[PDB]
Amino acid sequence: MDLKEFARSQMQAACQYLKEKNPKYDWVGFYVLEHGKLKLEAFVGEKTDHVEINLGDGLCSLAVLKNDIVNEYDVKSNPKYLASFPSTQSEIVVPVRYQGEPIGEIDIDSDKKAAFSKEDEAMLSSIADLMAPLVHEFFVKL
Amino acid sequence: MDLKEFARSQMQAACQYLKEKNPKYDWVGFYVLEHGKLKLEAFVGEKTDHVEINLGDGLCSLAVLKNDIVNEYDVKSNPKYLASFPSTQSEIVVPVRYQGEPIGEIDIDSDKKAAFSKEDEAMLSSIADLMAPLVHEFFVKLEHHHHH
Numbered sequence: 369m370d371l372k373e374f375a376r377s378q379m380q381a382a383c384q385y386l387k388e389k390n391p392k393y394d395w396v397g398f399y400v401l402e403h404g405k406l407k408l409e410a411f412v413g414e415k416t417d418h419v420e421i422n423l424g425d426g427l428c429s430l431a432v433l434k435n436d437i438v439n440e441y442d443v444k445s446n447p448k449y450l451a452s453f454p455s456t457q458s459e460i461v462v463p464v465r466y467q468g469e470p471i472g473e474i475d476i477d478s479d480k481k482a483a484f485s486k487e488d489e490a491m492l493s494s495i496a497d498l499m500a501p502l503v504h505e506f507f508v509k510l
Numbered sequence: 511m512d513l514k515e516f517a518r519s520q521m522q523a524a525c526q527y528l529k530e531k532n533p534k535y536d537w538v539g540f541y542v543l544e545h546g547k548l549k550l551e552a553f554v555g556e557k558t559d560h561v562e563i564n565l566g567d568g569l570c571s572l573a574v575l576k577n578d579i580v581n582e583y584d585v586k587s588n589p590k591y592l593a594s595f596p597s598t599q600s601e602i603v604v605p606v607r608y609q610g611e612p613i614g615e616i617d618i619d620s621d622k623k624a625a626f627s628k629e630d631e632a633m634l635s636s637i638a639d640l641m642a643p644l645v646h647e648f649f650v651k652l653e654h655h656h657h658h
């Protein structure tokens with residue numbers, strides 16, 4: 369076995385759990401920072417064209433640059449960003465940290481408007497902390 | 511908790527990976543310290559009778575009491591310990607630590623003798639460390655009236 373593949377299977381199980389337990393969560397994935405770029409390493413839902421994201425691009429980049437939650441309750445009334453899927457109406461990006469710094473993120477899309485409450489935020493923050501040591505196996509610094 | 515149930519599914523997925531990816535690993539479980547006793551919170555394999563374990567003489571206790579890996583190469587030929595399964599010939603218990611202190615463990619049985627090498631030990635220590643926050647969601651400190 370391998371610690372990277374072990375971490376992948378945990379991150380995959382977490383995506384699966386979050387999707388199955390929350391009716392409104394339509395797509396769930398973990399992006400990790402590798403050589404300055406965000407790379408998708410685990411997900412559940414339909415396939416995304418955006419497997420690698422250069423920074424500056426979107427809610428995904430923004431969560432890492434501000435080092436905080438970005439919760440967009442109406443993706444489609446926000447003329448400064450496009451989701452990856454046409455059905456998506458809200459999206460939340462939660463940072464995963466190592467020694468206080470973002471190394472990755474959990475990214476979730478809902479087909480419903482304003483899907484993510486402040487209670488979702490607190491829970492997802494808690495999950496990000498709990499998964500951090502796992503997600504870190506994928507981090508490759510600049 | 512929603513988080514406890516999330517943690518339990520992570521631990522469960524970890525036991526499944528451990529058992530599927532390692533041919534000698536026949537039973538995998540996470541025991542967690544809850545009010546000063548070990549409680550099995552996730553496992554893959556055959557049912558065990560040892561769901562709650564008082565701090566005692568077994569390998570499961572030893573890892574927590576010594577705070578170190580306990581690796582029995584030959585269970586049947588150790589007349590001081592009994593396994594949970596008659597097929598077991600080797601067993602390793604790896605402490606799960608949170609802030610330097612043991613809060614639980616990973617217990618693995620093999621039907622083969624001397625199943626657990628130094629490589630296994632080191633990989634399982636790493637695994638235990640990566641899983642610790644999650645196992646910690648089940649951790650509960652023993653608190654008696656006289657403590658405060």
Ligand SMILES: C[S@@](=O)CC[C@H](N)C(=O)O
Nearest residue numbers: 416425426427428451452
């Ligand atoms: C795969 S999709 O959830 C990633 C792109 C993200 N919507 C963004 O706004 O950055």
